[PDB]
Paper text:
Here, inspired by the pseudosymmetry observed in bacterial microcompartments and viral capsids, we developed a hierarchical computational method for designing large pseudosymmetric self-assembling protein nanomaterials. We computationally designed pseudosymmetric heterooligomeric components and used them to create discrete, cage-like protein assemblies with icosahedral symmetry containing 240, 540 and 960 subunits. At 49, 71 and 96 nm diameter, these nanocages are the largest bounded computationally designed protein assemblies generated to date. Here we show that designing pseudosymmetric protein building blocks, in which symmetry is broken at the sequence level while backbone symmetry is maintained, enables the construction of very large pseudosymmetric protein nanocages.
Unexpectedly, in a number of the GI4-F7 micrographs we also observed a 71-nm nanocage with a similar wireframe morphology and hexagonal pores. By counting the hexagonal pores we found that h = 3; thus the nanocage is T = 9 and we refer to it as GI9-F7. GI9-F7 can be explained by the presence of small amounts of ABB heterotrimer in AAB heterotrimer preparations. Analogous to the AAB heterotrimer, which forms a pentasymmetron through five roughly two-fold-symmetric A:A interfaces inherited from I3-01, the ABB heterotrimer forms a two-trimer ‘disymmetron’ structure held together by the same A:A interaction. In GI9-F7 this disymmetron occupies the icosahedral two-fold symmetry axes, providing the edges that connect three-fold-symmetric facets containing three ABB heterotrimers and three CCC homotrimers. As a result, GI9-F7 is quasisymmetric in addition to being pseudosymmetric: the A, B and C subunits each occupy multiple, distinct environments in the assembly. The asu of GI9-F7 therefore comprises one AAB trimer, one ABB trimer and one CCC trimer. Micrographs of SEC-purified GI9-F7 assemblies revealed enrichment of the target assembly, and we determined a cryo-EM structure of the nanocage to 6.7 Å resolution applying icosahedral symmetry, as well as a 4.0 Å resolution structure of the asu. Consistent with the accuracy with which we designed GI4-F7, the GI9-F7 cryo-EM structure deviates from the design model by only 11.5 Å Cα r.m.s.d. across all 540 subunits, 1.6% of the nanocage diameter, and superimposition of the designed asu with the structure yields a Cα r.m.s.d. of 4.6 Å across all 9 chains. As a result, the two designed nanocage interfaces (B:C and A:A) occupy five quasi-equivalent positions in GI9-F7.
Numbering used by the authors:
A (entry chain G), B (entry chain E), C (entry chain C): 2 to 204
D (entry chain B), F (entry chain I), H (entry chain F): 2 to 203
E (entry chain A), G (entry chain D), I (entry chain H): 20 to 223
The structure:
């Protein structure tokens, strides 16, 4: 159950790479850093050939999903490859219906009041807020009032200086697609440890 | 006519409460403070009991509506309860058509250029801008150019320091659902006086 | 080919006027300042009389289009008048079909991820960001990961101090609807030169 | 330099207006049309206002001087006003001394061989030939024999219809004035474009 | 002698007279006078011109205005002045004659052809210039000079006939000097020609 | 502590590489797989680069020592490198003095009873048994009779198929080395996981 | 040197010769002479103009007269005089050249275009004047100056060809200055053109 | 003598117990079964009680010594206790001096050629080979080539199934230990008999 | 005496000879020599080994290499050296013998079995070690020691026969010592066995 997994870890790797090899080296650096929730953006060359080969980490408690899924064809490949969850940059309907039938956790992207309501009426209680750096924590606070039953996972602009502010506002988890991926495997692992300690400290 | 009432008062209470009893007592404290335009968020326990039992203030010049309406069922109840106007956090189609048939003033929520245009094509000349604290007065200034016939009522992010800035940009009225409602009645009425003086001074 | 022209000049006049005489005087001041890409907001009284008249400058290397087109009827008139391209404040469906059939370059307005995706699926590789001053360069920075093949032309929020910042984020061109139009013809031409020099300096 | 500018542009516009604002609107339309050499008549009302107001065009590559300067006092004022060159209708020793000292390019007007073999002695190689409509292209060509080292910028008698013919006779540039400097700013720009394109060919 | 400007404006035509004798000059002067031409210029190309100028003084009381032309020296000018000429006209610009005429209070109109000569004439205080030969440059010269010389009036001589006498004035001309087109043939023919010139001018 | 760490993890990986970058990639895969005890062979090319580079893993709970150290000079370098423990293939009194003074855990290698009852005299309770392929688990079990207070960490002859058998004989930890440390980082991590899963059971 | 008036009157046509070399100038001078044109002007726009003038002196015994043209300075004039030039011709009116020529006793013909210097030229003692360019000022000038300047002889230069040569002579000009129309092409062609000019002039 | 006793009996039983009474019951069962050479483990609890209690067996022709002696102090105690011979796992010059002075038969343990050609120098002709299950009978036979004058009493890896094979390799006696010394006294006696009967044949 | 390393590599086989007499030793030593085994080790288990070494010296000229084995003392070594032995071999590691042999310039190859002994042997400067008994540890030992001892070569003795003699070399072996598998039976049988061993070794 993804809802419980998100609460337990409160952070997502949001992995990006330009190759199969980079994606694997990064995934190991991140996982070893204490970050269990990992998704691979479906832009990585042969991204599906990476997801299917991280089964070994699932056995270690890792959760492997796929990100930046914009169409159902990409979703179908990700699901067949063993993706545990699907994340979109926007709010589709075709992907949602497909995932629903398959039983795959799906999280649509939103930014506006109308997108929120539409997604809510489709049974989505967890929404991805993107770009998060544009609207900021005030968006979540504003929505909390009229929509107390909607949880958010903001992605982008998240760093060690403002990660606690997001949690103070009240979020489920934070997506870090820069400070938790850029650099060498040895550097990434260090960054991962800083994020885990900082989040645990504040919450 | 709501258009004239908004121009005359330039302020909306945007009331919230955790109970039927609180909503009534607060509404009176606010009205006594010089704020005639009051809407009750339709999330308050027994909100319909509150609205229908304030049918005494209308004779005093009070205007009573219902806000945070997301469904047609909520709208229908609010209208039956004697609500003069309906305000939504989003742009619906069903509520709008219902209100038109009933003859009830309706104000949809918008945030984007597309949402604005769609609402405009439905005959809405006054739009609710929400969250106001995210986009700020610059949004209104930008829209003034291409959409000179569209008026805004921003809600949220409004306080005694920046209220004149909103009016300088050019708005119809300001929705204050925090700075003028939080606390207890003996303080809320005083806050109301400061808001009235500040708005009157600048405009 | 407009795509190449935008890249070469990197700046758009975004002309606005209260009369045909003003529009002509401004267009000459701007063109003389080194700004070849000029679009006329189709709100100017007898705007079509300006578009058809300034066609004389096409021989001089000027490119003249029409902006602030909200409906197909306005588009049709602008195209008949000799407009080379059409720019909308929002993302329509009817205008793009008309323009496609005519072979007229069309650039829709967007603000949110959903709009970006919808427009992308309609074959639009260049999008207008409006209002630009609300989202800022951070929107462009974000929309590079999931959308590596989408170019943007922000309008508004552009001045002589932050023009380089926009290009650093990575934009195709900048629309200046204030500092490149307000003032006397002798002042406008001077402002235009400063914009050109600053852009050439940084890029 | 100037000589190089005449070779590069080959055309001079002469502005005359009943106001400063009018002069600016026309000057801008002319510049936009592709004409960088602008002469401001200095015998007009006000006069000492237009040169200053058009200063902003210099940064755009415009070169602005003072036309119909007939006296030394007018010349001095024109130079102080920011004129980069002085143009007259007759040869004057005092002007061809003050301008020299100040580093200001000056060109006298001529009509006969006897005026030509005088300006040359003072050191003038570029002469303004007037009235162009009286002497015609024949003057420019005929004088080339004995005076192959003299260049002309004739004014008057020149329009699009015969602009090529003037260049065939052999001139450095043509002064067309009101030929393109007339009507609304839009019309001025249109005519300026036609002249530039017409010349760029022969 | 500034009154000449007004007199030229009133008549707009000058008869230039040449002859082989006094009697011929006298008959021609009367013929143009009767024909409506009151501005009579007697040249000195005729070796009896002084006699003609003096004798014709009888017409002054009848409203005739008599002067002398083709004066090419100060000494000749002096004789013209003594003869009773009201105005002196020269084919060229001449400082020595101008200064003499100025001192004697005699109206003088120098001849010019080029912009540089027009300029020099201004320093002598001349507001009216004779354009000669008019047939070489034509009316376009007068128009061309309005720019640099907005306050200078011209009186062209030659190139003027009944076919173009009207258009000559469109250039902003004060008066026209007419030669053999006006003065030639019998006294009767001269008077008839004079009538034709006056009638056409007084109308356009 | 070390003695407790061996008891808790029960597995030690031994890394070798032809480059530092290779060593780091493998070390990370091994750690990710759940193996916290890492031995870096100190007889490799460069050698004194890998221990420093892997410093970042220590913060994650990794323990890194130096393998196949035979000389005191190598021990000194390994200690300066920040090695947490030193492991050899033979018993040496000078090494079992330097390491003691520096507070650095050290364990000698043994193969026979006469070496076992010597290392004990020097205060060693944990011995490295080599070659595992030659003596087998029977050596470990048999020696536990007369010497119940001696623990072994046998290296070599250890695979998934017989990893439990070694623990049945009675060892504190097993030295797997190349048994899992081979192939691509992805393959290394998989094998590291399999060993951990297999051990957790007996 | 009044003999020049007689020579201009008798020969009527004067050839104006230009070249980029001495060798070409010589070939042309000979062709022109053989064609029946005795009056030859060697311009100063040719390299080693002095060499050209001197080396053609052999034609003097054949009845040829060699002068120098396009002289714009006293120094150039002196060099031409020292080369045996019979006469000096200038494009303009020049007092310094005139005085030099008078002292040397060399015939000088200044250039004019307007009535004003025409007057001055007379006062300097010059009765024969060069009218230039003839491409701009036509025969109407000659048939006009006669009035005020009845004793001036003109020699129009330029604008003269085989079609209008009679028109100039009908105006009473002393001589015509012809270049390019006569002096062009090969030595044979030049002589042939020169013959054509002479024959037509004699016939009118 | 000992040397003669090994040749005569060809078998040694090694006893271990958690009590003195247990040791006695087993010792008697083993002796009754026909095994006269008894080695008492001296690393047991109490230890210095069993040798004295079994004194009564000496009169029956039993020969009782002490095994698993690793230290000099243990050796001294074992001799004082009435042990007639001392057996160790390693060669020790202090033990192979005290025992010599006291007239006590002693044999060191060996596993390698470098230990064998050392004990021989001190005068040991009978060596204990350990662990027998690690080297096997091939060691005894192979070493007979270069060292034909060395006899072994291997312990470990010895059972009824292969007891003859050990004698074929060429040993003076076999150390069986727990091979027969296990279970109830009745079972111990039975196994003791089986070993005696099996050996008497090859 | 480093040349021994090359000699071992060239032949890859050593005969380990034992006998109960000088006659048996000579016949057996010759039989293997004839069969192609040049490297012959004479043990001291033979009660005339010194005599055997001396008497067989005649084979040295034929390419035979004669040394002595099973040396367990310095005094015994001394006799072997005096007898003409080129190399000394021991079943164990012995410092006293090594030092003696080193001083005398005699190649000495000590026996080892465990990693600690391999290490100690390095302090004496040995590069070639005898592994004995080979059958106890097997080829896996030689491979295992390549890590810690990358510069040490081995010569396994014992456990070597025609069913594994080739395979032994796959472990990275310099040469193999063969006992009764090679030296046993009649002079004829011994020579035949020697040929079989050499023929099979030459392959892997």
């Amino acid at each position: 159950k993804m809802e419980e997994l998100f609460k337990e870890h409160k952070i997502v790797a949001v992995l990006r790479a330009n190759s199969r090899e980079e994606a694997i080296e990064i995934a190991l650096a991140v996982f070893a850093g204490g970050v269990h929730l990992i998704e691979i953006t479906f832009t990585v060359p042969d991204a599906d050939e990476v997801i299917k080969r991280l089964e070994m980490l699932k056995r270690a408690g890792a959760i492997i999903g796929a990100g930046t899924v914009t169409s159902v064809e990409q979703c179908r490949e990700a699901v067949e490859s063993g993706a545990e969850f699907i994340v979109s940059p926007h709010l589709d309907e075709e992907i949602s219906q497909f995932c629903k039938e398959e039983g795959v956790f799906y999280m649509p992207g939103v930014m506006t009041p109308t997108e929120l309501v539409k997604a809510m009426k489709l049974g989505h209680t967890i929404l991805k807020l993107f770009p998060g750096e544009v609207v900021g924590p005030q968006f979540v606070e504003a929505m909390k009032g009229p929509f107390p039953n909607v949880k958010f996972v903001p992605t982008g602009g998240v760093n060690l200086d403002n990660v606690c502010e997001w949690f103070e506002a009240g979020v489920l988890a934070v997506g870090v697609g820069s400070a938790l991926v850029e650099g060498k495997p040895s550097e990434v692992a260090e960054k991962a440890r800083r994020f885990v300690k900082k989040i645990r400290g504040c919450t």
